[model samples]
Target: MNVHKSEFDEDAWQFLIADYLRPEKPAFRKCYERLELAAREHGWSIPSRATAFRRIQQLDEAMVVACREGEHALM
Candidate 1:
Protein backbone atom coordinates (compact mmCIF):
# COMPACT_ATOMS: atom_id res chain seq x y z
CA MET A 1 0.00 0.00 0.00
CA ASN A 2 3.04 2.20 -0.10
CA VAL A 3 3.08 2.62 -3.84
CA HIS A 4 3.29 5.91 -5.68
CA LYS A 5 0.18 8.10 -5.61
CA SER A 6 -0.07 8.62 -9.38
CA GLU A 7 -0.01 4.86 -9.95
CA PHE A 8 -2.33 3.76 -7.17
CA ASP A 9 -4.80 6.56 -6.47
CA GLU A 10 -7.20 5.61 -9.24
CA ASP A 11 -7.24 1.96 -8.24
CA ALA A 12 -7.57 2.87 -4.60
CA TRP A 13 -10.38 5.29 -5.37
CA GLN A 14 -12.27 2.69 -7.36
CA PHE A 15 -11.90 0.11 -4.63
CA LEU A 16 -13.05 2.59 -2.02
CA ILE A 17 -16.03 3.63 -4.13
CA ALA A 18 -17.08 0.02 -4.71
CA ASP A 19 -16.59 -0.85 -1.08
CA TYR A 20 -19.14 1.83 -0.28
CA LEU A 21 -21.48 1.62 -3.26
CA ARG A 22 -22.67 -1.37 -5.24
CA PRO A 23 -23.53 -0.62 -8.84
CA GLU A 24 -26.06 -3.45 -8.91
CA LYS A 25 -28.30 -1.38 -6.67
CA PRO A 26 -31.60 -0.27 -8.18
CA ALA A 27 -30.50 3.33 -8.55
CA PHE A 28 -27.50 5.60 -8.56
CA ARG A 29 -29.11 7.56 -5.73
CA LYS A 30 -28.55 4.64 -3.42
CA CYS A 31 -24.97 4.37 -4.53
CA TYR A 32 -24.38 8.07 -4.12
CA GLU A 33 -25.97 8.07 -0.70
CA ARG A 34 -23.80 5.20 0.39
CA LEU A 35 -20.73 6.93 -0.95
CA GLU A 36 -21.67 10.11 0.87
CA LEU A 37 -22.14 8.24 4.09
CA ALA A 38 -18.77 6.58 3.73
CA ALA A 39 -17.13 9.87 2.90
CA ARG A 40 -18.62 11.54 5.95
CA GLU A 41 -17.51 8.70 8.15
CA HIS A 42 -13.99 8.96 6.77
CA GLY A 43 -13.87 12.78 6.79
CA TRP A 44 -13.45 12.95 3.02
CA SER A 45 -15.30 15.36 0.76
CA ILE A 46 -18.48 13.84 -0.60
CA PRO A 47 -18.51 14.12 -4.35
CA SER A 48 -21.71 15.31 -6.00
CA ARG A 49 -23.83 12.70 -7.74
CA ALA A 50 -22.95 14.18 -11.13
CA THR A 51 -19.25 14.03 -10.32
CA ALA A 52 -19.58 10.44 -9.18
CA PHE A 53 -21.43 9.51 -12.33
CA ARG A 54 -18.85 11.05 -14.63
CA ARG A 55 -15.85 9.62 -12.76
CA ILE A 56 -17.46 6.21 -12.81
CA GLN A 57 -17.96 6.61 -16.52
CA GLN A 58 -14.30 7.33 -17.01
CA LEU A 59 -13.32 4.35 -14.90
CA ASP A 60 -15.62 2.10 -16.87
CA GLU A 61 -14.18 3.25 -20.19
CA ALA A 62 -10.71 2.57 -18.85
CA MET A 63 -11.76 -1.04 -18.12
CA VAL A 64 -10.59 -0.84 -14.53
CA VAL A 65 -13.75 -2.57 -13.45
CA ALA A 66 -17.01 -4.11 -14.66
CA CYS A 67 -19.71 -1.46 -15.03
CA ARG A 68 -23.26 -2.05 -14.02
CA GLU A 69 -25.20 -0.43 -16.83
CA GLY A 70 -23.05 2.73 -16.70
CA GLU A 71 -21.42 2.44 -13.25
CA HIS A 72 -17.91 1.09 -12.52
CA ALA A 73 -15.54 -0.33 -9.90
CA LEU A 74 -12.23 -2.11 -9.44
CA MET A 75 -12.19 -5.64 -10.81
Candidate 2:
Protein backbone atom coordinates (compact mmCIF):
# COMPACT_ATOMS: atom_id res chain seq x y z
CA MET A 1 0.00 0.00 0.00
CA ASN A 2 1.17 3.51 -0.76
CA VAL A 3 1.84 5.44 2.42
CA HIS A 4 0.26 8.84 2.76
CA LYS A 5 2.59 11.74 3.54
CA SER A 6 2.68 12.47 7.24
CA GLU A 7 1.30 15.77 8.45
CA PHE A 8 4.17 15.83 10.88
CA ASP A 9 7.27 16.46 8.77
CA GLU A 10 10.97 16.48 9.65
CA ASP A 11 10.77 19.62 11.77
CA ALA A 12 7.85 18.33 13.76
CA TRP A 13 9.57 15.01 14.22
CA GLN A 14 12.66 16.84 15.50
CA PHE A 15 10.53 18.76 17.95
CA LEU A 16 9.11 15.51 19.25
CA ILE A 17 12.59 14.07 19.55
CA ALA A 18 13.74 17.05 21.60
CA ASP A 19 10.96 16.35 24.05
CA TYR A 20 11.56 12.64 23.91
CA LEU A 21 15.20 13.11 24.86
CA ARG A 22 14.46 15.37 27.81
CA PRO A 23 15.62 14.02 31.18
CA GLU A 24 12.05 14.06 32.45
CA LYS A 25 10.49 12.81 29.25
CA PRO A 26 6.89 11.80 29.51
CA ALA A 27 5.71 8.33 28.53
CA PHE A 28 5.58 7.71 24.79
CA ARG A 29 1.81 7.79 24.63
CA LYS A 30 1.70 11.01 26.61
CA CYS A 31 4.22 12.67 24.36
CA TYR A 32 2.26 11.63 21.28
CA GLU A 33 -0.97 12.93 22.77
CA ARG A 34 0.73 16.15 23.78
CA LEU A 35 1.89 16.78 20.24
CA GLU A 36 -1.62 16.28 18.95
CA LEU A 37 -2.96 18.73 21.47
CA ALA A 38 -0.30 21.30 20.62
CA ALA A 39 -0.98 20.89 16.94
CA ARG A 40 -4.64 21.66 17.41
CA GLU A 41 -3.90 24.55 19.71
CA HIS A 42 -1.39 26.03 17.28
CA GLY A 43 -3.42 25.30 14.07
CA TRP A 44 -1.05 22.69 12.66
CA SER A 45 -2.53 19.61 11.03
CA ILE A 46 -2.77 16.75 13.47
CA PRO A 47 -1.06 13.56 12.35
CA SER A 48 -2.40 10.08 13.05
CA ARG A 49 -0.70 7.84 15.60
CA ALA A 50 0.56 5.57 12.86
CA THR A 51 2.04 8.54 11.01
CA ALA A 52 3.71 9.86 14.12
CA PHE A 53 5.12 6.46 15.02
CA ARG A 54 6.44 5.89 11.53
CA ARG A 55 8.08 9.31 11.38
CA ILE A 56 9.66 8.78 14.77
CA GLN A 57 11.07 5.46 13.63
CA GLN A 58 12.45 7.04 10.47
CA LEU A 59 14.16 9.82 12.43
CA ASP A 60 15.59 7.31 14.89
CA GLU A 61 17.06 5.24 12.07
CA ALA A 62 18.60 8.32 10.53
CA MET A 63 20.12 9.29 13.87
CA VAL A 64 21.59 5.83 14.31
CA VAL A 65 23.16 5.87 10.88
CA ALA A 66 24.56 9.34 11.40
CA CYS A 67 26.02 8.41 14.75
CA ARG A 68 27.68 5.35 13.25
CA GLU A 69 29.16 7.42 10.44
CA GLY A 70 30.46 9.97 12.94
CA GLU A 71 32.10 7.25 14.97
CA HIS A 72 33.73 5.79 11.88
CA ALA A 73 35.02 9.21 10.83
CA LEU A 74 36.56 9.77 14.26
CA MET A 75 38.36 6.42 14.15
Whole-model Cα lDDT of every candidate shown, in order:
0.52, 0.62
Deviating ranges (above 4 Å) for candidate 2: 1-11, 61-75
Clashes within 3 Å, all models in order: 0, 0
**Model 2: worst 10 consecutive residues (lDDT sum):** 64-73
For model 1, residues 4-67, the per-residue Cα lDDT tens digits are: 4223235435645564344544456675566556656666665456665566665555443343
Each prediction's TM-score versus the true structure:
0.47, 0.52
lDDT of 2: 0.62
| Candidate 2 lDDT tens digits, 16-64 | 7677655554677877878877667666665677766676676666554
Q: For candidate 2, report its TM-score.
A: 0.52
Report the C-alpha displacement of residue 25, candidate 1, in angstroms. 4.5
Name the runs in model 1 displaced over 4 angstroms.
Answer: 1-12, 19-26, 61-75
Model 1 accuracy (lDDT, Cα): 0.52
